[PDB]
Design an enzyme around this catalytic site. Structure first.
Site, PDB file in Angstrom:
ATOM      1  NE  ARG A 250       9.494  47.463  72.068  1.00  4.08           N
ATOM      2  CZ  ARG A 250       8.847  47.976  73.122  1.00  4.08           C
ATOM      3  NH1 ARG A 250       8.881  47.399  74.323  1.00  4.08           N
ATOM      4  NH2 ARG A 250       8.246  49.139  72.996  1.00  4.08           N
TER       5      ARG A 250
ATOM      6  CG  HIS B  88       5.809  52.515  81.402  1.00  7.03           C
ATOM      7  ND1 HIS B  88       6.464  51.506  80.583  1.00  7.03           N
ATOM      8  CD2 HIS B  88       6.684  53.555  81.497  1.00  7.03           C
ATOM      9  CE1 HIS B  88       7.662  51.934  80.280  1.00  7.03           C
ATOM     10  NE2 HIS B  88       7.836  53.214  80.859  1.00  7.03           N
TER      11      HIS B  88
HETATM   12  N1  AR6 Z   1      10.670  34.365  81.157  1.00  9.62           N
HETATM   13  C1  AR6 Z   1      11.511  35.273  80.629  1.00  9.62           C
HETATM   14  N2  AR6 Z   1      12.778  35.332  81.136  1.00  9.62           N
HETATM   15  C2  AR6 Z   1      13.661  36.179  80.596  1.00  9.62           C
HETATM   16  N3  AR6 Z   1      13.467  37.065  79.627  1.00  9.62           N
HETATM   17  C3  AR6 Z   1      12.182  37.076  79.208  1.00  9.62           C
HETATM   18  C4  AR6 Z   1      11.172  36.216  79.624  1.00  9.62           C
HETATM   19  N4  AR6 Z   1      10.004  36.503  78.931  1.00  9.62           N
HETATM   20  C5  AR6 Z   1      10.282  37.546  78.175  1.00  9.62           C
HETATM   21  N5  AR6 Z   1      11.630  37.880  78.245  1.00  9.62           N
HETATM   22  C6  AR6 Z   1      12.322  38.999  77.628  1.00  9.62           C
HETATM   23  O1  AR6 Z   1      11.824  40.162  78.256  1.00  9.62           O
HETATM   24  C7  AR6 Z   1      11.965  41.304  77.381  1.00  9.62           C
HETATM   25  C8  AR6 Z   1      10.752  42.170  77.567  1.00  9.62           C
HETATM   26  O2  AR6 Z   1      10.900  43.324  76.628  1.00  9.62           O
HETATM   27  P1  AR6 Z   1       9.720  44.125  76.003  1.00  9.62           P
HETATM   28  O3  AR6 Z   1       8.731  43.133  75.466  1.00  9.62           O
HETATM   29  O4  AR6 Z   1      10.318  45.266  75.250  1.00  9.62           O
HETATM   30  O5  AR6 Z   1       9.015  44.715  77.375  1.00  9.62           O
HETATM   31  P2  AR6 Z   1       9.499  46.060  78.271  1.00  9.62           P
HETATM   32  O6  AR6 Z   1       8.929  45.866  79.625  1.00  9.62           O
HETATM   33  O7  AR6 Z   1      10.954  46.231  78.195  1.00  9.62           O
HETATM   34  O8  AR6 Z   1       8.647  47.101  77.469  1.00  9.62           O
HETATM   35  C9  AR6 Z   1       8.697  48.489  77.973  1.00  9.62           C
HETATM   36  C10 AR6 Z   1       7.431  49.205  77.619  1.00  9.62           C
HETATM   37  O9  AR6 Z   1       7.213  49.109  76.182  1.00  9.62           O
HETATM   38  C11 AR6 Z   1       5.833  48.941  75.905  1.00  9.62           C
HETATM   39  O10 AR6 Z   1       5.460  49.786  74.883  1.00  9.62           O
HETATM   40  C12 AR6 Z   1       5.133  49.268  77.243  1.00  9.62           C
HETATM   41  O11 AR6 Z   1       4.926  50.655  77.376  1.00  9.62           O
HETATM   42  C13 AR6 Z   1       6.127  48.710  78.262  1.00  9.62           C
HETATM   43  O12 AR6 Z   1       5.947  49.160  79.611  1.00  9.62           O
HETATM   44  C14 AR6 Z   1      12.196  40.753  75.973  1.00  9.62           C
HETATM   45  O13 AR6 Z   1      13.447  41.110  75.419  1.00  9.62           O
HETATM   46  C15 AR6 Z   1      12.128  39.214  76.140  1.00  9.62           C
HETATM   47  O14 AR6 Z   1      13.158  38.574  75.496  1.00  9.62           O
HETATM   48  O1  HW2 Z   2      -4.293  47.762  77.921  1.00 11.14           O
HETATM   49  C1  HW2 Z   2      -3.828  46.685  77.580  1.00 11.14           C
HETATM   50  C2  HW2 Z   2      -2.580  46.273  78.056  1.00 11.14           C
HETATM   51  O2  HW2 Z   2      -1.900  47.167  78.793  1.00 11.14           O
HETATM   52  C3  HW2 Z   2      -0.908  47.912  77.883  1.00 11.14           C
HETATM   53  O3  HW2 Z   2      -0.524  49.269  78.399  1.00 11.14           O
HETATM   54  C4  HW2 Z   2       0.715  49.740  77.731  1.00 11.14           C
HETATM   55  C5  HW2 Z   2       1.352  50.998  78.283  1.00 11.14           C
HETATM   56  O4  HW2 Z   2       2.688  50.711  78.775  1.00 11.14           O
HETATM   57  C6  HW2 Z   2       0.373  50.103  76.311  1.00 11.14           C
HETATM   58  O5  HW2 Z   2       1.636  50.476  75.694  1.00 11.14           O
HETATM   59  C7  HW2 Z   2      -0.354  48.942  75.518  1.00 11.14           C
HETATM   60  O6  HW2 Z   2      -1.130  49.543  74.459  1.00 11.14           O
HETATM   61  C8  HW2 Z   2      -1.323  48.036  76.332  1.00 11.14           C
HETATM   62  O7  HW2 Z   2      -1.393  46.749  75.610  1.00 11.14           O
HETATM   63  C9  HW2 Z   2      -1.946  45.120  77.615  1.00 11.14           C
HETATM   64  C10 HW2 Z   2      -0.680  44.567  78.036  1.00 11.14           C
HETATM   65  C11 HW2 Z   2      -0.062  43.666  77.194  1.00 11.14           C
HETATM   66  C12 HW2 Z   2       1.133  43.037  77.567  1.00 11.14           C
HETATM   67  C13 HW2 Z   2       1.676  43.294  78.793  1.00 11.14           C
HETATM   68  O8  HW2 Z   2       2.833  42.735  79.156  1.00 11.14           O
HETATM   69  C14 HW2 Z   2       1.075  44.185  79.676  1.00 11.14           C
HETATM   70  O9  HW2 Z   2       1.712  44.369  80.872  1.00 11.14           O
HETATM   71  C15 HW2 Z   2      -0.142  44.755  79.325  1.00 11.14           C
HETATM   72  O10 HW2 Z   2      -2.630  44.429  76.623  1.00 11.14           O
HETATM   73  C16 HW2 Z   2      -3.877  44.771  76.143  1.00 11.14           C
HETATM   74  C17 HW2 Z   2      -4.540  43.989  75.184  1.00 11.14           C
HETATM   75  C18 HW2 Z   2      -5.825  44.328  74.735  1.00 11.14           C
HETATM   76  O11 HW2 Z   2      -6.465  43.564  73.797  1.00 11.14           O
HETATM   77  C19 HW2 Z   2      -6.451  45.464  75.235  1.00 11.14           C
HETATM   78  C20 HW2 Z   2      -5.786  46.244  76.176  1.00 11.14           C
HETATM   79  O12 HW2 Z   2      -6.370  47.356  76.688  1.00 11.14           O
HETATM   80  C21 HW2 Z   2      -4.498  45.912  76.644  1.00 11.14           C
END
Ligand code: AR6
Ligand code: HW2
Ligand code: ZN
Length: 282
Positions: A56, A124
């Site tokens: 995001r 996850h």
């Molecule tokens: N170097 C950095 N330093 C600080 N902040 C950072 C950096 N790079 C990125 N960010 C911030 O890091 C944040 C990352 O937020 P999101 O991208 O929502 O990742 P999640 O781990 O919370 O996503 C949860 C689940 O959602 C998915 O569907 C999967 O199922 C995931 O497991 C952002 O607000 C960036 O600003």
């Molecule tokens: O499996 C992938 C992957 O892991 C993520 O698992 C997630 C379940 O939390 C699903 O929400 C997603 O759909 C999925 O992108 C990820 C992924 C992307 C960003 C990340 O920070 C990460 O840790 C993995 O990227 C993919 C890109 C592709 O073209 C094909 C893939 O199969 C993945």
């Protein structure tokens, strides 16, 4: 799943200026020194500086998808190296300053960094981990397990069983691994400090565990470049790159960030190493 709610994507980044950033990392040090039980909560923001894009952020997977563009990986999962933040978390555990590690990340980098699996919740799943449907035995592979959604990988259990092995990657509708969630929940309820790093906290219940530290008056620090769902509930919000934050913090704590040997798997936390004596606070 196609219409699966991806939440708020591509919010503007915030950067604390240098003087404020230095003062808030000092305060984070003070909190870490004072705390009995520190729990860290990690999301995809801690792996962006190893070439794996977040979900995001401005160039996150879902942000890019919303604008009809593709995310960009600067690495394979197999060639991804643990960041400075990853390795700082290894050291903080080994000297007893981290009680537990809760991660939403599937990238396998905490396990591969050497972080002990008995102090880690992978809420996850793990790209590199397959589990026996029969005996529940987990295997930590050197390559990504080629399926998602808890499917048969094609491999059988070798326990002394022949059970079907399945990936550990949850699809949208899947409920969290009961063991990992129970331990994350207990660690978060009992913590008096929860520090979030590179998570927007938008996913339930993963994003809500840090809030459980607040009950019985625990403190909550959020380190993130973007706003997060629970910024209002933070005692401290630090807007900076998590590597800059964690390396300054380690220097305040008198700790070195240890060397990564390449992919290694530690099942059980080792006995605690020595740590520096604490500053007088106040
Ligand atoms: N170097 C950095 N330093 C600080 N902040 C950072 C950096 N790079 C990125 N960010 C911030 O890091 C944040 C990352 O937020 P999101 O991208 O929502 O990742 P999640 O781990 O919370 O996503 C949860 C689940 O959602 C998915 O569907 C999967 O199922 C995931 O497991 C952002 O607000 C960036 O600003
Ligand atoms: O499996 C992938 C992957 O892991 C993520 O698992 C997630 C379940 O939390 C699903 O929400 C997603 O759909 C999925 O992108 C990820 C992924 C992307 C960003 C990340 O920070 C990460 O840790 C993995 O990227 C993919 C890109 C592709 O073209 C094909 C893939 O199969 C993945
Ligand atoms: Zn088995």
């Amino acid at each position: 799943p196609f219409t699966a709610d991806k939440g708020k994507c591509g919010l503007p980044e915030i950067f604390d200026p240098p003087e404020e950033l230095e003062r808030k990392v000092w305060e984070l040090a003070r909190l870490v020194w004072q705390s009995s039980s520190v729990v860290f909560h990690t999301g995809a923001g801690i792996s962006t500086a190893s070439g794996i894009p977040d979900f995001r952020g401005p160039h996150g997977v879902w942000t890019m998808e919303e604008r009809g563009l593709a995310p960009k990986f600067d690495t394979t999962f197999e060639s991804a190296r643990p960041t400075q933040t990853h390795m700082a978390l290894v050291q903080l555990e080994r000297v007893g300053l981290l009680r537990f590690l809760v991660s939403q990340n599937v990238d396998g980098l905490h396990v591969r960094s050497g972080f002990p699996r008995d102090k880690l919740a992978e809420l996850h799943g793990n790209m590199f981990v397959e589990e026996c449907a029969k005996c529940k035995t987990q295997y930590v592979r050197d390559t990504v397990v080629g399926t998602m959604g808890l499917k048969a990988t094609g491999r059988l259990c070798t326990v002394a069983c022949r059970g079907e092995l399945r990936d550990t990657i949850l699809d949208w509708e899947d409920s969290l691994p009961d063991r990992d969630l129970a331990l994350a929940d207990e660690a978060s309820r009992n913590a008096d400090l929860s520090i979030t790093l590179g998570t927007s906290l938008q996913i339930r219940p993963s994003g809500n565990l840090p809030l459980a530290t607040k009950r019985r008056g625990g403190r909550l620090v959020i380190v993130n470049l973007q706003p997060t769902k629970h910024d209002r509930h933070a005692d401290l919000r630090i807007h900076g790159y998590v590597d800059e934050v964690m390396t300054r913090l380690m220097k305040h704590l008198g700790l070195e960030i240890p060397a990564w040997d390449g992919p290694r798997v530690l099942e059980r936390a080792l006995p605690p190493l020595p740590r520096p004596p604490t500053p007088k606070l106040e």
